[PDB]
């Protein structure tokens, strides 16, 4: 059961995530008839699905050393590149998801002043800058990505810090701060402010249109802040747990493997958030078909 339950979760998530991301890509691309179809918010969503797709395509390249035998079959040459690419595919989605949150704050609390700079050229400039910042953040990932000698005839890819007694703390905290701590605060603060400034004073709050508008933005803002937290907190909570822990047990290893699966779930549920919570997207999907 232990050898079949863990592969089942990864297989189901990979298949479900591929279908969901493909639907978002298929609907947005095919909404027009062979014409350029992009917009300042529409640029972010297609960019997010691409990074979510890369993070899911590379899933077998990082989990093959966890299920059957714990042996790395890609050598040291791919040990550094895949780990750097996989960390980039996770980090970039966090940065894209965070910047997309600030963009929505601009368009709601500042409806008049934000028209000066919420341009497609600026949106392209930021996203190109977001990718660059990911490489700086994953710099220690590929600098220290060397093969690790396991007892017996097996070896595996991993992180071998020059001073593992003391260097373990900064590596754990910096990924916790950059990929979980700061982006969650930025995303949560941005969306709660939107909920407090999403309607006008003159607007008919008694009318169902305002109330229905308040509900949908609230449940969309909550889900985005909840999906990111739920799918990444247990993964990084254990990171602080293992700083002072030396000998893991079977229960801890099973939880960490289950935590990794939730990590691939965030990029699996992000396309479904747009499919479900965006009523506009449903109409856009029908146009392609």
């Amino acid at each position: 059961y232990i050898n079949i339950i863990m592969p089942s979760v990864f297989g189901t998530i990979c298949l479900l995530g591929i279908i969901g991301n493909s639907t978002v890509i298929f609907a947005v691309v095919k909404k027009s008839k062979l014409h350029w179809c992009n917009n300042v918010p529409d640029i972010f969503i297609i960019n997010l699905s691409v990074v979510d797709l890369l993070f899911l395509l590379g899933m077998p390249f990082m989990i093959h050393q966890l299920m059957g035998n714990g042996v790395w079959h890609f050598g040291e040459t791919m040990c550094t590149l895949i780990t750097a690419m996989d960390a980039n595919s996770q980090f970039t989605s966090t940065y894209i998801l965070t910047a997309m949150a600030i963009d929505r704050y601009l368009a709601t609390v500042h409806p008049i002043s934000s028209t000066k700079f919420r341009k497609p050229s600026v949106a392209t400039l930021v996203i190109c800058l977001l990718w660059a910042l990911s490489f700086i953040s994953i710099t220690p990932v590929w600098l220290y990505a060397r093969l690790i000698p396991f007892p017996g005839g097996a070896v595996g890819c991993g992180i071998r810090l020059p001073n593992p007694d003391t260097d373990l703390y900064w590596f754990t905290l910096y990924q916790f701060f950059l990929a979980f701590a700061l982006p969650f605060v930025v995303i949560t603060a941005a969306y709660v402010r939107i909920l407090q400034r999403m309607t006008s004073s003159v607007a008919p709050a008694s009318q169902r249109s305002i109330r229905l508008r308040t509900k949908r933005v609230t449940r969309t803002a909550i889900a985005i802040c909840l999906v990111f937290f739920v799918c990444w907190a247990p993964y990084y909570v254990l990171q602080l747990t293992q700083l002072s822990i030396s000998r893991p047990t079977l229960t801890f290893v099973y939880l960490y493997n289950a935590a990794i699966s939730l990590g691939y779930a965030n990029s699996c549920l992000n396309p479904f958030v747009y499919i479900v919570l965006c009523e506009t997207f449903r109409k856009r999907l029908v146009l392609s078909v």
């Binding site: 050898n3 990082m62 989990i63 050393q65 966890l66 059957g68 035998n69 714990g70 780990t83 996989d86 960390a87 990932v141 990505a145 690790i148 396991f150 007892p151 097996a154 595996g156 890819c157 991993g158 992180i159 071998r160 593992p164 007694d165 373990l168 590596f171 754990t172 990924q175 990171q239 293992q242 030396s246 000998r247 893991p248 047990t249 079977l250 290893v253 960490y256 990794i260 990590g263």
Partner: peptide, 17 residues
């Protein structure tokens, strides 16, 4: 089917201390 008690750091392994 192996000794799955190795230390972890990120989504990859780390040498136990």
């Amino acid at each position: 089917d192996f000794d799955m008690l190795r230390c972890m750091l990120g989504r990859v392994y780390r040498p136990c201390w």
